[PDB]
Structure formats: C-alpha cells, structure tokens
Structure 1
Amino acid sequence: AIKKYKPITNGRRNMTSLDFAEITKTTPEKSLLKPLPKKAGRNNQGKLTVRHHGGGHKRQYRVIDFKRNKDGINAKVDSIQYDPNRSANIALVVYADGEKRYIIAPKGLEVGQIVESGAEADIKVGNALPLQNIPVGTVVHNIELKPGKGGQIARSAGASAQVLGKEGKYVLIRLRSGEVRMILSTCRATIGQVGNLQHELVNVGKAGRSRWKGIRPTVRGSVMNPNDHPHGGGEGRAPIGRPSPMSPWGKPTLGKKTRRGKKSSDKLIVRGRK
C-alpha cells in the first residue's frame, strides 16, 4: 500500500512512500551485478548536454533478461527484489539446471510459480511468447520491436498494451499512451501487466529527497538575463512577451510538433496520440 507520514517536521507534512510489501528479499544476486558510474548529463566531450542530472545515491546495475531467450525450460520464481534503476521491481528466476536470471516482475506473480518461454508456452502471467501465438484481447508487456532484440515497449511500472487484431505479418497493438501500432508478429511479449502499480502516488515531500535521486534544481527562464534565455530580462516580473513560449535554445515550446517527416515507421502507425 502506501504509508502516510505523521507531520512531525515541516518537511514531512505531506509525504508518502511505498511500504515495499511486495519485496520479499532485500539483497541482490551477486553474479548479476555490474557497476554503473554516474555521467551526470555530460557526453564524451565532457560537456553538459542535458540539464538537471546530478548526483544521487550510488547504485549498481542489475542485468535484466529483456529478450526471453531460454526456451522450453521452465523456471521457478525465487524472489521479488527492489531495483534502483527502474520503477518496476524485479524477479529472480532460476531455471531447471541452475541458471539464474532477473526479469521484470509482473503484477500478480508469486514466489514459487513457474515461468517459461516459447511458442509452446501457454497464456498465463509472466510467460513470454511470439505475438503470433498470443490471442487477441489480452494485455501484454515487455514487447519487442525487432525479433530477438529484446523487449522495449511497456516496461515501466504499471504498464501494458493489448493485442487488437492481426494483419498479414503484423499485429495491431494499442500502446499505453493511447496510440495503436503495428508490430512484427515474430516479436515476443510477456503476458500481463508490469507490477508495482502505486509508484505514481508517492509524494516526494521534501526538496532533498529529490536530490537523493540525482535531480539538480531547475531555474525558470523568465528570471534569467537576456543573454541566457529568450524569456529573460524585464524590469519587474514580466509576461512572456513573445508570440510563443521558447526553449532556452530558442525554439517554440508549447505545441509545435517535433517528430520528423519521412520516418520509415510512419506507415506502421495507424492512429497516434501524444
């Protein structure tokens, strides 16, 4: 659920967090860990390219099995663990000979239950299949985009798409943003919704808790100077005195579409939103 905090400080006045009651083992698997040094928005020339990325806690990368490869060998779910690198939790699965992997934990998934992959597999939560063998109307997550590449769509907390119909070698799928799309029928997907659904409701509460996640502050354009931002300058406070609002790099920012013409996936997108 979500725990509310008692207002003992002004910083805890309206703060909530998760109770982490789905987490069943609070210590990661040693052989599936890699380093993840921060690169706080600075590219290979060392300059800042995206603003507001900073320094939070040290975390480590857990390697996730986004292509469900091991096929026709079932696996037991060992634990549901926490991951600082995403908003879902992860599940440790152990295959029938002893190989351990991590996967994204779906919504109702229990320690002990069985999970498998392939065309031979059956439709229950956490099995991975090609989109061809998945009946129309079910909810799926972790959807590949090119066959064998690994899942790319609907991996965040509480995310799913549903199968809508079948073309020749495409299926129709309705994404979480409300757009519908064609995907190659040999791309895989796993059955069910991604878990940890109450992630959207936690109130962060105090400025410094944002800093624990590596968010640096953001200063608005209209209180900078005219060489810094198009909204800058003006004697007192001032309106945005332009026909449109602007980026700091001077492009119109409030309604101008930015998708490029002539992408090859323009004929795959039947109906789009956002």
Structure 2
Amino acid sequence: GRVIRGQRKGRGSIFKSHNHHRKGAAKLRHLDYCEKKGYIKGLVKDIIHDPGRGAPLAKVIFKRTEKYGKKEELIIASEGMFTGQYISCGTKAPLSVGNILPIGKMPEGTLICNLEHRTGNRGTLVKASGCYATVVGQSEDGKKTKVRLPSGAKKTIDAKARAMVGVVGAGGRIDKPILKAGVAHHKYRVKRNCWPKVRGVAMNPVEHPHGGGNHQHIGHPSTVSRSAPAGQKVGLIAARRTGLLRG
C-alpha cells in the first residue's frame, strides 16, 4: 500500500519544526574554569516567551572572564525568578532558586531543573513547564547522585552534572481545557504540523493498518511488537498492559 502518516514525518518536509519565531536554544553556561572552581554571577535582563515552549525563557547576561565583553545566554526560567535578579552558577555557588549548581552540592530533597545528564551537556532534563527533578541521594563513595525525574523514573547521574535550583515556570498550563479546536490549532501552528489527527480507523487500507472495512473497526490486536517495522508500529507500541490504568 501507501506510506503512512507517521512514515512521512521522518523526511521532515512539511513536517519540520516551525523554527522561525523562536528566540533561540535554551542552554546553560559553558562549563568554564569559573563554574568548575567557584561561581560566576549574571543578571536576568528579561524574561521572555518562546513560541513552541510552554515555559518562558530568561535571558541572563554574564561577563566573560577571559575577554572584555558581556555575553548573553538563554536559560529556562524557574518559577519565582525576575528581571534584575542575580544568578549564580558554580561549584561554590549558594543554594537559592535561580542559581546553577552541581547535583553533588545540594542536600537531598532539593528541587532542580534544566539538569545535564552528563557534565557539559548544557542541560537536558526537566525542561517543560511545571516540571522538576528531586535529589534523592548521594553515593557514599561520592561521584554519583540519585535523582527522580517527573516520570517517576529514578536515575543515577554524575555529581559534577549541573542543575538549576527551583522549578520551571508556567506550571499547570495543562490544567486548563483547550476549550476550542482553534486554540489547539494556534498552539501546534507554532510547533510543527502534527494537528488535525485523523484516526487510522477512518482511513482506507492503502493508508493505514487500521484502514477500511464496512464498519470502521481495528480488526486486529492493536498492540504491536517492538520488533515490528515502519508501517506496523501504528497502534499501541510494545504495550505491557492495556485498559484503564488501575495501578
């Protein structure tokens, strides 16, 4: 038959991200001598909306320790940060909302965001509006730290890995119903063209495993193996259980 919707996506044509209006990538500071041995202070000069995001960014300006000039970075804004607030980043930084510290230097229970999964990664985990990771332990041999991601998953990362004390701004955005179709239209219009979503069951056979039939029904189990191929991964991929989640 034909190429399914999903398959089309990968070539990225009309299916690339809508990148034009975005302010730029959100990234932590480069991991310089400063950040590794002491702290460096910056100022959030403005907090600003990024289109495809649900969380505002903070433009924070730093002084280059190696060259005369100010340099502007793009952080994700933690809740409670404000314009003209001072941000401190480094091994020997103090533990306040907004600052950026190695996970090793925060007592357990601390709440962090924009976490690097390896050191230097410029921040990778807990970025979406509302989310945070919690420090749940530091190994007695040191070196690693144990964190709990918004999913529930526990992961062990390097203590040298950086993070930002506090929670990401714009929380509870998902609490409000997207009452109208058009408001969702507007939302995805700034991400990528994954809206309208036709049901495979509403398609013809050429178009989808689910396609066709006199009655509009799936016709076969809709749980597909991990070891399926491109046009078979169409329903509930690799589903370990199904039905209303009781656990």
* Contact 2:56-2:170 at 8 Å conserved across structures: yes
Match of 2:222 among 237, 240, 244: 244
Aligned length: 214
CA distance, structure 2, for counterparts of residue 242 and residue 59 of structure 1: 43
CA distance, structure 2, for counterparts of residue 229 and residue 99 of structure 1: 50
> Mind listing any 5+ residue stretches in structure 1 that lack a counterpart?
1-40, 259-274
* Contact 1:67-1:149 at 8 Å conserved across structures: no
Structure 1 residues 50 and 196: alpha-carbon distance in aligned structure 2, compared to 1, 3 A threshold: farther
Residues 1:88 and 2:73 are matched in the alignment: no
% identity of equivalent residues: 31
Residues 1:156 and 2:128 are matched in the alignment: yes
CA distance, structure 2, for counterparts of residue 54 and residue 117 of structure 1: 34
Q: Which residue in the other structure is 1:64 paired with? A: 26
* Contact 2:59-2:72 at 8 Å conserved across structures: yes
Q: Output one character per residue of 1:129-156: Cα deviation in whole Å (capped at 9) or x when no partner.
A: 1111111110111110111121100011
Moved more, 68-77 or 78-87: 68-77
Match of 2:198 among 219, 226, 233: 219
SS in 1 for 2:45: strand
Structure 1 residues 209 and 252: alpha-carbon distance in aligned structure 2, compared to 1, 3 A threshold: closer
TM-score, with structure 1 as normaliser: 0.68
CA distance, structure 1, for counterparts of residue 182 and residue 16 of structure 2: 12
Structure 1 residues 58 and 207: alpha-carbon distance in aligned structure 2, compared to 1, 3 A threshold: farther
Moved more, 61-70 or 103-112: 61-70
Q: Output one character per residue of 1:184-236: Cα deviation in whole Å (capped at 9) or x when no partner.
A: 1111111011111132134333333333333432211112222322222211x
Please list, as runs of the form range in 1=range in 2, the aligned pairs for 1:58-137 lying within 5 A after superposition: 58-67=20-29, 69=31, 71=35, 72-96=39-63, 98-137=70-109
Structure 1 residues 120 and 175: alpha-carbon distance in aligned structure 2, compared to 1, 3 A threshold: same
> Mind listing any 5+ residue stretches in structure 2 that lack a counterpart?
64-68, 241-247
Q: Which residue in the other structure is 2:213 paired with? A: 234
CA distance, structure 2, for counterparts of residue 161 and residue 55 of structure 1: 27
CA distance, structure 1, for counterparts of residue 203 and residue 73 of structure 2: 49
CA distance, structure 1, for counterparts of residue 26 and residue 18 of structure 2: 22
